[PDB]
Amino acid sequence: GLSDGEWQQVLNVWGKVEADIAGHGQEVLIRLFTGHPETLEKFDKFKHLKTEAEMKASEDLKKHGTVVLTALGGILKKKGHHEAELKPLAQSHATKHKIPIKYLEFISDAIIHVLHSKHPGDFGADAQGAMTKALELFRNDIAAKYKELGFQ
Ligand SMILES: O=N[O-]
Ligand SMILES: O=N[O-]
Ligand SMILES: O=N[O-]
Ligand code: NA
């Protein structure tokens, strides 16, 4: 569980994301799909994208990036009280979309990467750690719902 100061650092960093949610969303998904090509393969609507240039040109990928980070913002603002988001997201991601927990780790790595690549001057090591802990908390809670379902 995060401290009050850790949550405050998480949500302060998140303010930077909200100044350009679309640009953030696009860069996180590009980082994910290029760094871990298996992840792109799970997304039927984006698997036609073959280069970084095609990815950057897709208005739909940019939209989806906005939708995903907006949903993540919603979760982070609950400061761990996100139980109501767990079954639905685990259910869509485990059951509908067959997304391993490992891929959730990859997008967490991507978020941290893109956050540091844009906000060097805020997202110092301590803020990185707090953000990592917030992302890990959500993933750990999703993992228990994957285990409940027997996902493989
Ligand atoms: O891209 N997460 O749906
Ligand atoms: O779309 N909410 O995860
Ligand atoms: O995208 N992980 O560095
Ligand atoms: Na969902």
Side-chain angles (χ1 to χ4, degrees):
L2 280 69
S3 79
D4 295 317
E6 287 170 333
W7 283 117
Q8 198 180 30
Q9 291 174 262
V10 168
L11 296 175
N12 189 255
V13 169
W14 205 260
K16 310 188 141 212
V17 176
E18 294 183 338
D20 178 22
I21 180 118
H24 283 73
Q26 183 198 54
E27 296 185 27
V28 163
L29 291 179
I30 291 173
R31 174 68 179 191
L32 177 66
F33 297 153
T34 65
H36 301 97
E38 64 278 39
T39 67
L40 177 64
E41 185 79 336
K42 292 251 179 191
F43 266 99
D44 281 340
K45 69 186 189 167
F46 298 130
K47 66 181 191 183
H48 66 282
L49 299 168
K50 288 304 198 297
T51 69
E52 180 171 349
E54 286 172 356
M55 300 176 192
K56 286 266 323 172
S58 171
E59 290 303 323
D60 202 54
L61 183 160
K62 184 174 199 193
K63 192 52 192 171
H64 189 70
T66 301
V67 174
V68 174
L69 301 189
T70 291
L72 180 52
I75 290 158
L76 291 177
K77 286 170 190 186
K78 297 196 170 175
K79 302 185 298 184
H81 288 112
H82 45 233
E83 175 75 48
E85 292 71 13
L86 299 172
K87 287 259 180 305
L89 274 169
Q91 202 58 222
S92 56
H93 283 83
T95 299
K96 205 189 166 192
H97 296 305
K98 304 257 315 139
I99 303 307
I101 293 292
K102 186 78 168 176
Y103 291 18
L104 305 192
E105 187 187 359
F106 295 152
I107 199 171
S108 171
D109 292 346
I111 292 168
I112 300 291
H113 185 87
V114 166
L115 245 24
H116 181 267
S117 174
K118 289 181 172 284
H119 310 111
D122 272 56
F123 201 56
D126 60 339
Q128 291 160 43
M131 184 60 72
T132 296
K133 284 179 183 211
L135 300 178
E136 286 184 357
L137 175 61
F138 186 77
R139 192 167 69 249
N140 196 68
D141 284 349
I142 285 288
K145 297 307 193 187
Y146 276 44
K147 185 179 175 299
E148 181 188 338
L149 292 170
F151 175 91
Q152 309 134 284

